[PDB]
Paper text:
CDKs share a conserved protein kinase domain that comprises a smaller N-terminal lobe linked through a hinge to a larger C-terminal fold (Endicott et al., 2012). We have used biophysical measurements and X-ray crystallography to investigate the ATP-competitive inhibitor binding properties of cyclin-free and cyclin-bound CDK1 and CDK2.
The purine-based CDK1-cyclin B-selective inhibitor CGP74514A is a less-potent CDK inhibitor, and binds with reduced affinity to CDK1-cyclin B and to CDK2-cyclin A under these experimental conditions. A comparison of the binding modes of each of these three inhibitors to CDK1-cyclin B-Cks2 and to CDK2-cyclin A reveals that each inhibitor exploits very similar interaction networks to bind to both complexes, consistent with their comparable binding affinities measured by ITC. Our structural data show that cyclin-bound CDK1 and CDK2 form the two conserved hydrophobic spines. In total, these elements form 133 and 145 inter-lobe contacts (<4.0 Å) for CDK1-cyclin B and CDK2-cyclin A, respectively.
Author numbering:
A (entry chain B): 172 to 432
B (entry chain A): 0 to 37, 41 to 298
The structure:
Protein backbone atom coordinates (compact mmCIF):
# COMPACT_ATOMS: atom_id res chain seq x y z
CA UNK A 1 0.00 0.00 0.00
CA UNK A 2 2.96 2.36 0.61
CA UNK A 3 3.88 1.30 -3.01
CA UNK A 4 0.26 1.95 -4.14
CA UNK A 5 -0.24 -1.21 -6.35
CA UNK A 6 -3.69 -0.10 -7.64
CA UNK A 7 -2.31 3.31 -8.87
CA UNK A 8 1.46 3.05 -9.64
CA UNK A 9 0.96 2.41 -13.35
CA UNK A 10 -1.56 5.28 -13.85
CA UNK A 11 0.88 7.51 -11.90
CA UNK A 12 3.88 6.48 -14.05
CA UNK A 13 1.86 7.23 -17.25
CA UNK A 14 0.82 10.64 -15.89
CA UNK A 15 4.40 11.59 -15.00
CA UNK A 16 5.66 10.65 -18.46
CA UNK A 17 3.12 13.07 -19.94
CA UNK A 18 3.97 15.96 -17.52
CA UNK A 19 7.72 15.48 -17.99
CA UNK A 20 7.23 16.66 -21.62
CA UNK A 21 5.07 19.70 -20.63
CA UNK A 22 7.55 20.89 -17.89
CA UNK A 23 10.61 20.61 -20.18
CA UNK A 24 12.97 23.62 -20.42
CA UNK A 25 14.06 24.92 -23.84
CA UNK A 26 17.06 22.81 -24.77
CA UNK A 27 19.24 25.70 -26.04
CA UNK A 28 18.32 28.53 -23.69
CA UNK A 29 21.82 29.42 -22.54
CA UNK A 30 23.07 30.77 -25.92
CA UNK A 31 20.16 33.28 -25.99
CA UNK A 32 21.03 34.49 -22.47
CA UNK A 33 23.40 37.47 -23.13
CA UNK A 34 24.96 37.79 -19.64
CA UNK A 35 25.20 34.21 -18.32
CA UNK A 36 26.72 30.82 -19.16
CA UNK A 37 26.61 27.13 -18.34
CA UNK A 38 29.61 27.71 -16.05
CA UNK A 39 27.64 30.29 -13.97
CA UNK A 40 24.61 27.99 -13.64
CA UNK A 41 27.03 25.18 -12.65
CA UNK A 42 28.25 27.40 -9.76
CA UNK A 43 24.61 28.20 -8.72
CA UNK A 44 23.42 24.57 -8.65
CA UNK A 45 26.48 23.58 -6.57
CA UNK A 46 25.61 26.36 -4.11
CA UNK A 47 22.03 25.02 -3.81
CA UNK A 48 23.37 21.55 -2.96
CA UNK A 49 25.34 23.18 -0.10
CA UNK A 50 22.24 25.06 1.10
CA UNK A 51 20.29 21.78 1.05
CA UNK A 52 22.89 20.04 3.26
CA UNK A 53 23.07 23.03 5.68
CA UNK A 54 19.28 23.14 6.26
CA UNK A 55 18.87 19.35 5.91
CA UNK A 56 16.32 19.53 3.03
CA UNK A 57 15.01 16.56 1.01
CA UNK A 58 16.78 15.78 -2.30
CA UNK A 59 13.45 16.19 -4.12
CA UNK A 60 13.47 19.86 -2.95
CA UNK A 61 16.77 20.42 -4.82
CA UNK A 62 15.65 18.66 -8.02
CA UNK A 63 12.45 20.77 -8.11
CA UNK A 64 14.28 24.08 -7.59
CA UNK A 65 16.54 23.31 -10.50
CA UNK A 66 13.46 22.54 -12.69
CA UNK A 67 12.00 25.98 -11.71
CA UNK A 68 15.25 27.75 -12.53
CA UNK A 69 15.63 26.17 -15.97
CA UNK A 70 12.05 26.99 -16.95
CA UNK A 71 12.26 30.60 -15.71
CA UNK A 72 15.54 31.18 -17.62
CA UNK A 73 13.95 29.52 -20.71
CA UNK A 74 11.82 32.67 -21.06
CA UNK A 75 13.39 35.54 -18.97
CA UNK A 76 16.74 37.34 -19.52
CA UNK A 77 18.75 37.69 -16.27
CA UNK A 78 21.92 39.66 -15.43
CA UNK A 79 24.74 37.82 -13.68
CA UNK A 80 24.14 39.95 -10.53
CA UNK A 81 20.56 38.59 -10.18
CA UNK A 82 21.05 34.86 -10.95
CA UNK A 83 21.44 34.16 -7.22
CA UNK A 84 18.12 36.04 -6.41
CA UNK A 85 16.26 33.80 -8.93
CA UNK A 86 17.89 30.64 -7.45
CA UNK A 87 17.04 31.66 -3.85
CA UNK A 88 13.34 32.29 -4.72
CA UNK A 89 13.19 28.95 -6.51
CA UNK A 90 14.53 27.11 -3.42
CA UNK A 91 11.98 28.94 -1.20
CA UNK A 92 9.16 27.89 -3.54
CA UNK A 93 10.40 24.32 -3.71
CA UNK A 94 10.67 24.08 0.13
CA UNK A 95 7.21 25.49 0.65
CA UNK A 96 5.86 22.88 -1.80
CA UNK A 97 7.78 19.80 -0.70
CA UNK A 98 9.08 20.24 2.89
CA UNK A 99 7.25 19.47 6.14
CA UNK A 100 9.32 22.21 7.88
CA UNK A 101 10.50 24.79 5.35
CA UNK A 102 13.03 27.34 6.60
CA UNK A 103 11.71 30.85 7.09
CA UNK A 104 12.17 33.59 4.50
CA UNK A 105 14.68 35.33 6.81
CA UNK A 106 17.02 32.28 6.67
CA UNK A 107 16.92 32.39 2.83
CA UNK A 108 18.11 36.04 3.15
CA UNK A 109 20.84 35.06 5.63
CA UNK A 110 22.36 32.42 3.24
CA UNK A 111 22.85 35.06 0.48
CA UNK A 112 25.25 37.17 2.76
CA UNK A 113 22.81 40.15 2.65
CA UNK A 114 23.45 40.53 -1.11
CA UNK A 115 19.64 40.95 -1.34
CA UNK A 116 16.87 42.30 0.92
CA UNK A 117 13.85 40.34 2.20
CA UNK A 118 11.62 42.65 0.08
CA UNK A 119 13.58 41.56 -3.04
CA UNK A 120 13.32 37.81 -2.28
CA UNK A 121 9.56 38.00 -1.74
CA UNK A 122 9.00 39.93 -5.02
CA UNK A 123 11.14 37.48 -6.99
CA UNK A 124 8.95 34.71 -5.44
CA UNK A 125 5.82 36.35 -6.99
CA UNK A 126 7.51 36.86 -10.41
CA UNK A 127 8.60 33.19 -10.56
CA UNK A 128 5.04 32.16 -9.75
CA UNK A 129 3.68 34.45 -12.53
CA UNK A 130 6.23 33.15 -15.05
CA UNK A 131 5.51 29.46 -14.22
CA UNK A 132 1.69 30.14 -13.91
CA UNK A 133 1.86 28.20 -10.58
CA UNK A 134 2.75 24.85 -12.31
CA UNK A 135 4.95 23.62 -9.50
CA UNK A 136 4.28 19.83 -9.31
CA UNK A 137 6.89 18.86 -11.86
CA UNK A 138 8.25 15.39 -12.34
CA UNK A 139 11.87 14.88 -11.30
CA UNK A 140 14.61 12.29 -11.73
CA UNK A 141 13.97 11.10 -8.17
CA UNK A 142 10.28 10.52 -8.78
CA UNK A 143 11.20 7.99 -11.54
CA UNK A 144 14.24 6.53 -9.71
CA UNK A 145 12.25 5.47 -6.61
CA UNK A 146 9.78 3.63 -8.85
CA UNK A 147 12.61 1.91 -10.74
CA UNK A 148 14.14 0.81 -7.39
CA UNK A 149 11.10 -1.41 -6.83
CA UNK A 150 12.37 -3.80 -9.58
CA UNK A 151 15.41 -5.07 -7.67
CA UNK A 152 15.89 -8.84 -7.20
CA UNK A 153 16.97 -8.14 -3.65
CA UNK A 154 16.88 -4.47 -2.75
CA UNK A 155 20.37 -3.00 -2.49
CA UNK A 156 21.24 0.26 -0.63
CA UNK A 157 24.52 0.99 -2.38
CA UNK A 158 22.73 0.62 -5.73
CA UNK A 159 20.03 3.09 -4.61
CA UNK A 160 22.43 5.71 -3.17
CA UNK A 161 24.74 5.46 -6.20
CA UNK A 162 21.88 6.08 -8.68
CA UNK A 163 20.80 9.14 -6.58
CA UNK A 164 24.36 10.54 -6.69
CA UNK A 165 24.69 10.13 -10.49
CA UNK A 166 21.23 11.67 -11.03
CA UNK A 167 22.26 14.62 -8.87
CA UNK A 168 25.56 15.01 -10.77
CA UNK A 169 23.56 15.60 -14.01
CA UNK A 170 21.88 18.70 -12.52
CA UNK A 171 25.16 20.71 -12.63
CA UNK A 172 25.92 20.49 -16.39
CA UNK A 173 23.24 21.96 -18.74
CA UNK A 174 25.39 20.80 -21.66
CA UNK A 175 24.40 18.30 -22.35
CA UNK A 176 21.83 17.04 -19.80
CA UNK A 177 19.08 19.56 -20.82
CA UNK A 178 18.40 17.45 -23.96
CA UNK A 179 17.46 14.36 -21.87
CA UNK A 180 14.16 13.84 -20.04
CA UNK A 181 14.09 13.04 -16.27
CA UNK A 182 12.86 9.46 -16.95
CA UNK A 183 15.79 8.76 -19.27
CA UNK A 184 18.50 10.22 -17.08
CA UNK A 185 17.00 8.19 -14.20
CA UNK A 186 17.10 5.00 -16.31
CA UNK A 187 20.78 5.55 -17.28
CA UNK A 188 21.70 6.33 -13.70
CA UNK A 189 19.91 3.16 -12.49
CA UNK A 190 21.61 0.89 -15.03
CA UNK A 191 24.98 2.45 -14.36
CA UNK A 192 24.64 2.01 -10.59
CA UNK A 193 23.43 -1.61 -11.01
CA UNK A 194 26.43 -2.49 -13.23
CA UNK A 195 29.11 -0.72 -11.16
CA UNK A 196 28.00 -2.48 -7.92
CA UNK A 197 26.53 -5.88 -8.85
CA UNK A 198 27.48 -6.37 -12.53
CA UNK A 199 23.75 -6.67 -13.47
CA UNK A 200 21.87 -4.80 -16.27
CA UNK A 201 18.62 -2.90 -16.88
CA UNK A 202 15.98 -5.63 -16.26
CA UNK A 203 13.27 -6.88 -18.70
CA UNK A 204 10.66 -5.81 -16.11
CA UNK A 205 11.64 -2.11 -16.60
CA UNK A 206 11.75 -2.64 -20.36
CA UNK A 207 8.13 -3.71 -19.89
CA UNK A 208 7.14 -0.69 -17.70
CA UNK A 209 9.03 2.04 -19.55
CA UNK A 210 9.42 0.87 -23.14
CA UNK A 211 13.10 1.91 -22.80
CA UNK A 212 15.83 -0.52 -23.95
CA UNK A 213 19.56 -0.44 -23.45
CA UNK A 214 19.89 0.60 -27.11
CA UNK A 215 17.54 3.66 -26.75
CA UNK A 216 19.37 4.61 -23.51
CA UNK A 217 22.85 4.41 -25.09
CA UNK A 218 23.38 8.16 -25.88
CA UNK A 219 22.57 9.39 -22.33
CA UNK A 220 24.31 6.34 -20.84
CA UNK A 221 27.53 7.36 -22.70
CA UNK A 222 27.47 11.02 -21.48
CA UNK A 223 26.74 9.88 -17.90
CA UNK A 224 29.63 7.35 -17.90
CA UNK A 225 32.03 10.14 -18.80
CA UNK A 226 30.59 12.47 -16.12
CA UNK A 227 31.16 9.76 -13.47
CA UNK A 228 34.77 9.16 -14.65
CA UNK A 229 35.56 12.96 -14.65
CA UNK A 230 33.84 13.75 -11.30
CA UNK A 231 36.95 13.89 -9.12
CA UNK A 232 38.39 16.52 -11.59
CA UNK A 233 35.17 18.71 -12.01
CA UNK A 234 35.35 22.31 -10.90
CA UNK A 235 32.34 21.84 -8.51
CA UNK A 236 32.66 19.26 -5.73
CA UNK A 237 29.72 19.72 -3.26
CA UNK A 238 27.85 16.60 -4.49
CA UNK A 239 30.92 14.30 -4.19
CA UNK A 240 31.45 15.74 -0.67
CA UNK A 241 27.79 15.13 0.23
CA UNK A 242 27.75 11.50 -0.88
CA UNK A 243 30.80 10.70 1.34
CA UNK A 244 28.40 10.62 4.30
CA UNK A 245 27.26 7.41 5.98
CA UNK A 246 23.68 8.54 5.27
CA UNK A 247 24.33 7.69 1.57
CA UNK A 248 26.68 4.76 2.30
CA UNK A 249 29.83 6.69 1.20
CA UNK A 250 29.08 5.79 -2.44
CA UNK A 251 31.08 8.69 -3.92
CA UNK A 252 34.19 6.63 -2.89
CA UNK A 253 33.24 3.66 -5.14
CA UNK A 254 35.41 3.49 -8.27
CA UNK A 255 33.66 3.85 -11.60
CA UNK A 256 34.06 1.02 -14.11
CA UNK A 257 36.58 1.62 -16.93
CA UNK A 258 34.21 0.22 -19.58
CA UNK A 259 30.47 -0.35 -20.28
CA UNK A 260 30.11 -3.41 -22.64
CA UNK A 261 27.34 -1.53 -24.56
CA UNK B 1 -10.12 40.65 -14.34
CA UNK B 2 -11.38 41.79 -10.85
CA UNK B 3 -13.61 44.66 -12.09
CA UNK B 4 -15.92 42.19 -13.97
CA UNK B 5 -17.02 40.44 -10.74
CA UNK B 6 -19.91 41.78 -8.57
CA UNK B 7 -19.83 40.51 -4.94
CA UNK B 8 -23.22 39.09 -3.82
CA UNK B 9 -22.80 37.77 -0.25
CA UNK B 10 -20.27 36.22 2.12
CA UNK B 11 -20.45 32.43 2.42
CA UNK B 12 -17.85 31.81 5.17
CA UNK B 13 -14.28 30.95 6.13
CA UNK B 14 -12.33 27.88 4.92
CA UNK B 15 -9.00 26.21 5.81
CA UNK B 16 -7.45 29.53 4.76
CA UNK B 17 -8.91 32.71 3.24
CA UNK B 18 -12.57 33.72 3.10
CA UNK B 19 -15.21 32.64 0.55
CA UNK B 20 -17.71 34.93 -1.28
CA UNK B 21 -20.48 34.30 -3.77
CA UNK B 22 -20.20 36.55 -6.88
CA UNK B 23 -21.43 37.17 -10.42
CA UNK B 24 -19.49 37.68 -13.67
CA UNK B 25 -21.07 40.83 -15.11
CA UNK B 26 -20.34 40.07 -18.79
CA UNK B 27 -20.87 36.36 -18.91
CA UNK B 28 -23.58 35.74 -16.23
CA UNK B 29 -21.65 33.01 -14.43
CA UNK B 30 -22.03 32.65 -10.65
CA UNK B 31 -18.67 31.87 -9.01
CA UNK B 32 -17.10 31.38 -5.60
CA UNK B 33 -14.16 33.70 -4.78
CA UNK B 34 -11.52 32.68 -2.23
CA UNK B 35 -9.69 35.80 -1.05
CA UNK B 36 -6.23 35.32 0.54
CA UNK B 37 -4.47 38.34 2.14
CA UNK B 38 -0.75 39.08 1.70
CA UNK B 39 5.16 38.42 6.79
CA UNK B 40 6.22 35.28 4.85
CA UNK B 41 5.11 35.66 1.20
CA UNK B 42 2.65 33.27 -0.45
CA UNK B 43 1.53 30.53 2.03
CA UNK B 44 2.48 26.93 1.14
CA UNK B 45 -1.18 26.13 1.70
CA UNK B 46 -2.10 28.15 -1.46
CA UNK B 47 0.92 26.98 -3.49
CA UNK B 48 -0.30 23.43 -3.10
CA UNK B 49 -4.03 24.10 -3.68
CA UNK B 50 -3.42 26.13 -6.79
CA UNK B 51 -0.82 23.85 -8.38
CA UNK B 52 -2.63 20.58 -7.69
CA UNK B 53 -6.13 21.93 -8.72
CA UNK B 54 -4.82 23.28 -12.04
CA UNK B 55 -3.78 19.68 -12.92
CA UNK B 56 -7.02 17.96 -11.76
CA UNK B 57 -10.04 18.19 -14.11
CA UNK B 58 -12.82 15.79 -13.19
CA UNK B 59 -16.59 16.17 -12.77
CA UNK B 60 -16.38 15.31 -9.00
CA UNK B 61 -13.54 17.69 -8.11
CA UNK B 62 -14.24 21.39 -7.69
CA UNK B 63 -13.13 23.42 -10.71
CA UNK B 64 -10.54 26.22 -10.31
CA UNK B 65 -11.37 28.80 -12.98
CA UNK B 66 -8.77 31.56 -12.59
CA UNK B 67 -6.09 33.05 -10.28
CA UNK B 68 -6.05 36.87 -10.03
CA UNK B 69 -2.72 37.99 -8.67
CA UNK B 70 -3.25 41.60 -7.53
CA UNK B 71 0.17 41.64 -5.60
CA UNK B 72 -1.54 42.92 -2.40
CA UNK B 73 -4.20 40.12 -2.43
CA UNK B 74 -4.60 36.73 -4.18
CA UNK B 75 -8.10 35.83 -5.54
CA UNK B 76 -9.04 32.29 -6.52
CA UNK B 77 -12.04 32.03 -8.85
CA UNK B 78 -13.99 28.72 -8.52
CA UNK B 79 -17.26 27.25 -9.95
CA UNK B 80 -20.14 28.00 -7.49
CA UNK B 81 -21.88 25.19 -5.61
CA UNK B 82 -25.04 25.66 -3.61
CA UNK B 83 -24.37 23.86 -0.31
CA UNK B 84 -21.98 21.51 1.49
CA UNK B 85 -22.95 18.00 2.59
CA UNK B 86 -22.83 18.84 6.32
CA UNK B 87 -25.53 21.53 6.02
CA UNK B 88 -27.67 19.21 3.83
CA UNK B 89 -27.50 16.49 6.51
CA UNK B 90 -28.84 18.98 9.13
CA UNK B 91 -31.65 19.97 6.70
CA UNK B 92 -32.57 16.22 6.46
CA UNK B 93 -32.21 15.44 10.25
CA UNK B 94 -35.87 14.50 10.68
CA UNK B 95 -36.86 12.57 7.47
CA UNK B 96 -33.39 11.08 6.60
CA UNK B 97 -31.55 10.95 3.30
CA UNK B 98 -33.12 8.66 0.69
CA UNK B 99 -30.97 5.56 -0.08
CA UNK B 100 -30.67 6.22 -3.83
CA UNK B 101 -29.07 9.63 -3.04
CA UNK B 102 -26.58 8.10 -0.50
CA UNK B 103 -25.62 5.56 -3.17
CA UNK B 104 -25.15 8.24 -5.87
CA UNK B 105 -23.09 10.51 -3.62
CA UNK B 106 -20.86 7.66 -2.36
CA UNK B 107 -20.32 6.52 -6.01
CA UNK B 108 -19.35 10.05 -7.23
CA UNK B 109 -16.98 10.63 -4.20
CA UNK B 110 -15.16 7.39 -5.05
CA UNK B 111 -14.79 8.45 -8.70
CA UNK B 112 -13.24 11.74 -7.66
CA UNK B 113 -10.99 10.10 -5.10
CA UNK B 114 -9.79 7.43 -7.55
CA UNK B 115 -8.88 10.29 -9.93
CA UNK B 116 -6.88 12.09 -7.19
CA UNK B 117 -4.97 8.89 -6.30
CA UNK B 118 -4.18 8.17 -10.04
CA UNK B 119 -2.64 11.68 -10.29
CA UNK B 120 -0.37 11.30 -7.29
CA UNK B 121 -2.53 13.40 -4.85
CA UNK B 122 -3.59 12.81 -1.25
CA UNK B 123 -6.58 14.79 -0.01
CA UNK B 124 -6.00 14.64 3.77
CA UNK B 125 -9.12 16.42 5.08
CA UNK B 126 -12.15 14.60 3.77
CA UNK B 127 -15.16 15.54 5.90
CA UNK B 128 -18.75 16.61 5.08
CA UNK B 129 -17.89 20.37 5.35
CA UNK B 130 -15.38 19.93 2.44
CA UNK B 131 -17.82 18.07 0.05
CA UNK B 132 -19.93 20.46 -2.08
CA UNK B 133 -23.27 19.68 -3.82
CA UNK B 134 -25.47 21.20 -6.55
CA UNK B 135 -29.08 21.36 -7.80
CA UNK B 136 -28.51 18.79 -10.62
CA UNK B 137 -27.44 15.96 -8.23
CA UNK B 138 -23.66 16.25 -8.21
CA UNK B 139 -21.28 16.12 -5.24
CA UNK B 140 -17.63 17.32 -5.48
CA UNK B 141 -14.36 17.08 -3.47
CA UNK B 142 -13.26 20.57 -2.37
CA UNK B 143 -10.77 22.28 -0.06
CA UNK B 144 -7.26 21.14 -1.15
CA UNK B 145 -5.45 23.29 1.46
CA UNK B 146 -4.11 20.22 3.29
CA UNK B 147 -3.50 18.15 0.11
CA UNK B 148 -0.10 16.90 -0.98
CA UNK B 149 1.59 15.38 -4.04
CA UNK B 150 3.09 11.98 -3.09
CA UNK B 151 5.91 9.82 -4.53
CA UNK B 152 6.04 6.05 -5.14
CA UNK B 153 6.76 4.62 -2.64
CA UNK B 154 5.69 7.32 -0.16
CA UNK B 155 8.02 9.13 2.23
CA UNK B 156 7.26 10.47 5.71
CA UNK B 157 4.84 13.37 5.32
CA UNK B 158 3.30 15.68 7.91
CA UNK B 159 1.89 14.01 11.00
CA UNK B 160 -0.64 16.69 12.14
CA UNK B 161 -3.25 15.57 9.47
CA UNK B 162 -6.99 15.01 8.96
CA UNK B 163 -9.75 16.28 11.26
CA UNK B 164 -9.92 14.04 14.38
CA UNK B 165 -13.27 12.31 13.73
CA UNK B 166 -12.25 11.17 10.23
CA UNK B 167 -8.63 10.20 11.08
CA UNK B 168 -7.33 6.72 10.29
CA UNK B 169 -5.77 4.43 12.93
CA UNK B 170 -2.34 4.37 11.30
CA UNK B 171 -2.12 8.19 11.82
CA UNK B 172 -3.41 7.93 15.40
CA UNK B 173 -0.78 5.22 16.22
CA UNK B 174 2.11 7.27 14.79
CA UNK B 175 3.35 5.11 11.87
CA UNK B 176 6.32 6.31 9.86
CA UNK B 177 4.40 6.15 6.55
CA UNK B 178 0.80 6.65 5.47
CA UNK B 179 -0.70 6.33 1.99
CA UNK B 180 -3.96 6.47 -0.05
CA UNK B 181 -5.78 4.27 2.55
CA UNK B 182 -6.03 7.31 4.83
CA UNK B 183 -8.60 8.91 2.46
CA UNK B 184 -10.67 5.70 2.26
CA UNK B 185 -11.01 5.56 6.07
CA UNK B 186 -12.47 9.10 5.99
CA UNK B 187 -14.83 8.22 3.17
CA UNK B 188 -16.04 5.20 5.19
CA UNK B 189 -16.74 7.37 8.28
CA UNK B 190 -18.74 9.65 5.93
CA UNK B 191 -20.80 6.81 4.36
CA UNK B 192 -21.91 5.76 7.89
CA UNK B 193 -22.66 9.39 8.64
CA UNK B 194 -24.94 9.86 5.56
CA UNK B 195 -27.01 6.80 6.69
CA UNK B 196 -27.24 7.93 10.36
CA UNK B 197 -26.92 11.79 10.40
CA UNK B 198 -24.39 11.61 13.25
CA UNK B 199 -20.62 11.09 13.28
CA UNK B 200 -19.37 7.56 13.66
CA UNK B 201 -16.37 8.21 15.96
CA UNK B 202 -16.75 11.58 17.69
CA UNK B 203 -13.71 11.61 20.00
CA UNK B 204 -12.45 14.56 22.12
CA UNK B 205 -8.71 13.65 21.97
CA UNK B 206 -6.25 11.33 20.18
CA UNK B 207 -6.66 8.63 22.90
CA UNK B 208 -10.51 8.87 23.22
CA UNK B 209 -10.79 8.69 19.39
CA UNK B 210 -8.72 5.49 19.39
CA UNK B 211 -10.84 4.01 22.21
CA UNK B 212 -14.11 4.78 20.40
CA UNK B 213 -12.79 3.04 17.25
CA UNK B 214 -11.62 -0.03 19.25
CA UNK B 215 -15.01 -0.22 21.03
CA UNK B 216 -16.87 -0.55 17.72
CA UNK B 217 -14.43 -2.51 15.57
CA UNK B 218 -12.46 -4.46 18.20
CA UNK B 219 -9.04 -3.71 19.68
CA UNK B 220 -6.63 -4.91 16.96
CA UNK B 221 -3.91 -7.55 17.60
CA UNK B 222 -1.20 -9.24 15.53
CA UNK B 223 -3.60 -11.60 13.66
CA UNK B 224 -5.98 -8.91 12.33
CA UNK B 225 -3.11 -6.38 11.72
CA UNK B 226 0.52 -7.64 11.55
CA UNK B 227 2.91 -5.10 13.12
CA UNK B 228 0.30 -3.14 15.20
CA UNK B 229 1.93 -4.36 18.43
CA UNK B 230 5.21 -2.52 17.49
CA UNK B 231 3.77 0.86 16.38
CA UNK B 232 5.24 3.93 18.12
CA UNK B 233 2.07 4.97 20.04
CA UNK B 234 0.76 1.44 20.66
CA UNK B 235 0.63 0.62 24.41
CA UNK B 236 0.33 -3.03 25.68
CA UNK B 237 -1.94 -1.67 28.46
CA UNK B 238 -4.70 -0.71 25.93
CA UNK B 239 -8.03 -2.34 26.83
CA UNK B 240 -8.95 -5.36 24.62
CA UNK B 241 -12.59 -4.75 23.50
CA UNK B 242 -14.44 -7.45 21.54
CA UNK B 243 -15.47 -6.65 17.97
CA UNK B 244 -19.28 -6.22 17.55
CA UNK B 245 -21.41 -7.29 14.53
CA UNK B 246 -21.66 -4.62 11.81
CA UNK B 247 -25.37 -5.18 11.69
CA UNK B 248 -25.24 -3.42 15.10
CA UNK B 249 -22.90 -0.61 13.99
CA UNK B 250 -25.23 0.60 11.18
CA UNK B 251 -28.60 -1.19 11.73
CA UNK B 252 -30.57 0.12 8.70
CA UNK B 253 -27.91 -0.79 6.10
CA UNK B 254 -28.46 -3.77 3.73
CA UNK B 255 -26.08 -6.77 3.40
CA UNK B 256 -24.16 -5.16 0.48
CA UNK B 257 -23.64 -1.75 2.20
CA UNK B 258 -22.27 -3.58 5.27
CA UNK B 259 -19.86 -5.49 3.04
CA UNK B 260 -18.57 -2.27 1.47
CA UNK B 261 -18.35 -0.32 4.77
CA UNK B 262 -16.42 -3.13 6.52
CA UNK B 263 -13.96 -3.20 3.64
CA UNK B 264 -13.48 0.60 3.80
CA UNK B 265 -12.87 0.49 7.63
CA UNK B 266 -10.42 -2.46 7.62
CA UNK B 267 -7.71 -1.97 10.26
CA UNK B 268 -4.80 -2.98 8.09
CA UNK B 269 -4.04 -0.31 5.45
CA UNK B 270 -2.71 -3.05 3.08
CA UNK B 271 -6.11 -4.88 3.04
CA UNK B 272 -8.33 -1.78 3.00
CA UNK B 273 -10.28 -1.50 -0.27
CA UNK B 274 -9.07 1.03 -2.90
CA UNK B 275 -11.40 3.71 -4.38
CA UNK B 276 -10.86 2.05 -7.77
CA UNK B 277 -11.97 -1.46 -6.59
CA UNK B 278 -14.88 -0.06 -4.52
CA UNK B 279 -16.48 1.21 -7.79
CA UNK B 280 -17.09 -2.46 -8.79
CA UNK B 281 -18.78 -3.49 -5.52
CA UNK B 282 -22.30 -5.03 -5.76
CA UNK B 283 -23.68 -2.12 -3.58
CA UNK B 284 -23.60 0.06 -6.71
CA UNK B 285 -25.41 -2.50 -9.00
CA UNK B 286 -28.54 -0.35 -9.44
CA UNK B 287 -27.07 3.12 -9.01
CA UNK B 288 -28.49 6.32 -10.54
CA UNK B 289 -28.00 10.10 -10.20
CA UNK B 290 -31.23 11.67 -8.80
CA UNK B 291 -31.36 15.37 -7.74
CA UNK B 292 -31.41 16.16 -4.00
CA UNK B 293 -34.85 15.84 -2.37
CA UNK B 294 -34.90 19.38 -0.65
CA UNK B 295 -34.05 22.93 -1.84
CA UNK B 296 -30.40 24.15 -1.37
C1 LIG C 1 -14.41 27.52 -2.97
C2 LIG C 1 -15.24 26.47 -3.64
N1 LIG C 1 -16.68 26.61 -3.38
C3 LIG C 1 -17.67 26.64 -4.31
N2 LIG C 1 -18.88 26.74 -3.80
C4 LIG C 1 -18.64 26.77 -2.44
C5 LIG C 1 -19.50 26.86 -1.34
N3 LIG C 1 -20.84 26.97 -1.57
C6 LIG C 1 -21.89 27.22 -0.65
C7 LIG C 1 -22.93 28.12 -0.91
C8 LIG C 1 -23.91 28.34 0.05
C9 LIG C 1 -23.90 27.63 1.24
C10 LIG C 1 -22.86 26.75 1.46
CL1 LIG C 1 -22.78 25.84 2.93
C11 LIG C 1 -21.86 26.54 0.55
N4 LIG C 1 -18.95 26.84 -0.11
C12 LIG C 1 -17.60 26.74 0.03
N5 LIG C 1 -17.10 26.74 1.27
C13 LIG C 1 -17.83 27.07 2.48
C14 LIG C 1 -16.86 27.70 3.48
C15 LIG C 1 -17.41 27.70 4.91
C16 LIG C 1 -18.88 27.37 4.98
C17 LIG C 1 -19.14 25.99 4.40
C18 LIG C 1 -18.52 25.81 3.02
N6 LIG C 1 -17.55 24.68 3.05
N7 LIG C 1 -16.71 26.66 -0.97
C19 LIG C 1 -17.29 26.68 -2.17
Amino acid sequence: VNEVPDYHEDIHTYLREMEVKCKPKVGYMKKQPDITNSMRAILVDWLVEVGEEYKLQNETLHLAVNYIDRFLSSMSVLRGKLQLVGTAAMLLASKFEEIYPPEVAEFVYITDDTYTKKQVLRMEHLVLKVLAFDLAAPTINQFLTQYFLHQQPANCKVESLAMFLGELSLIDADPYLKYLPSVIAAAAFHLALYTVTGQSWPESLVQKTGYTLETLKPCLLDLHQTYLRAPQHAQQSIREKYKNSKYHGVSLLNPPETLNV
Amino acid sequence: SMENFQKVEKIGEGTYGVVYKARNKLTGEVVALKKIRLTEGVPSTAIREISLLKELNHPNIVKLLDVIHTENKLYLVFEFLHQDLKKFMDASALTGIPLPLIKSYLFQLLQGLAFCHSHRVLHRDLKPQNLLINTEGAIKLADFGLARAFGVPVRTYTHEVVTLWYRAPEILLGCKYYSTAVDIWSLGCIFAEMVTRRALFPGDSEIDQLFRIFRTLGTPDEVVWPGVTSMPDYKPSFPKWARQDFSKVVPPLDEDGRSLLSQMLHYDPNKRISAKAALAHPFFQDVTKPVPHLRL
